[PDB]
Amino acid sequence: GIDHTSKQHKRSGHRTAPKSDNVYLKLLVKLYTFLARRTDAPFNKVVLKALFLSKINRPPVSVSRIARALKQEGAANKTVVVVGTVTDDARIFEFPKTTVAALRFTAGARAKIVKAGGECITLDQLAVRAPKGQNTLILRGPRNSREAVRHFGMGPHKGKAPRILSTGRKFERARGRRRSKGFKV
Template sequence: MEFRRVHNRLLLSRTNKASMSLSRIAKFSRGEENTGKVIVVPTAVLDDVRLPTIPKMRVCALRFSKMAARRIEAAGGECLTFDQFATENPTGSNTLLLRGRKSRREVVKSYGAAGVPGSHTKPKCTHKKNERGRGRRRSREWKVKSFKYAQK
């Protein structure tokens, strides 16, 4: 791992610096090739209550939530800041660099063209008046009458 890559990740905007949960970190730390490695996460590490037990792991992160830090240390692991990690391991060897998923934001659901056949885009407008289906298309069996005449 190069510290330049970590530096670039630290400079990302808040939108692009997605947080990571303990379950995701535990998932990536499994396996023989990742045992004993320091997991470097240049963002916040949050607790995940869905994971009952976490393995022993050393995690270096920008910040930890209180419960995440408590659970890592209770499992026999270690929470490191970047200053501690740099003094301990100046070469940055034997590490695993991870990042959170940027596509988990709510706004990503509305990317794309809403109303197009086959599109699963979330409509930006949630009012039924503006989203009422008109015309014949694959998802409708018959042509819908105009809303103005349907009320009579």
């Protein structure tokens, strides 16, 4: 026998193809594992993983978040990749030119980008254009802006938001939520 020092037959714990079942996504994966295996280029390697990512690890990148990244010093001509969908943001009043490459473009986002004379590339087109990912700027959206993570870590003095359905006063705002009713959290 063997004094094992570590749990046996452990799975690596990382996705390895998408759990998604879409052909096209399956094809883009085909492109990039090829590209990853044969180009020693970091970008293709990161891109391949993001493809496997489930919906929650793929938060939307907005078109305003886009415009801001372009305002980085020396970044205004880069083409931005977003392995996910791109949404529109009425709140910005002046969107730049550039080229965004992403999986989905909402109707309004595509509009706004094209209106400023930008261009909307799919990842496979992005590939042919920059097989080593030259001049690419990768953007991710906010994962912990989900509503779910509000409730993560619920406990005393954690200050983190109840799992509650109806709300307003007389919904969990008395005993243990204020000094005058028993105590506070």
